[PDB]
């Protein structure tokens, strides 16, 4: 028997937390994916460095 207004406030508050949580996950997904692509480039450079370090 809580008031509708009170229930609606809680509803919206929890809804906002969900939105903020999902926003966070999307940002983290994007940055981890960026990181993963960047590892492709660094590995390519490091492979070159390894062989150069081994020459002579």
């Amino acid at each position: 028997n809580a008031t509708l207004k009170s229930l609606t406030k809680q509803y919206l508050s929890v809804s906002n937390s969900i939105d903020e949580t999902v926003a966070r996950y999307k940002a983290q997904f994007t940055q981890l994916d960026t990181m993963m692509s960047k590892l492709n480039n660094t590995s390519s450079y490091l492979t070159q460095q390894f062989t150069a370090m081994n020459k002579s």
């Binding site: 996950y25 983290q28 997904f29 981890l32 993963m36 590892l39 490091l46 460095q49 081994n54």
Partner: protein
Amino acid sequence: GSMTSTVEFINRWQRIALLSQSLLELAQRGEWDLLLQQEVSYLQSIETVMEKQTPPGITRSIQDMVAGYIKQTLDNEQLLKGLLQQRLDELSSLIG
């Protein structure tokens, strides 16, 4: 003078290998926010061996020592890519 230049050279590459292990372990422990912070340093440390050259007169023994750090960094990076993909999949599911 240049015994300093050899250790600095050695330290540049050891730092890269260090940060590479740090990233891997942070990923293993599911510490994704710290991983992304540490990533910043890792990339900066790669840039350092691009801006500075291998000095002349590094012996074979030291070249071998550093080659070991480079190999270890590659090994870690490879493992890391798998953990990252797994996390990306975990996140897609959470995101919906």
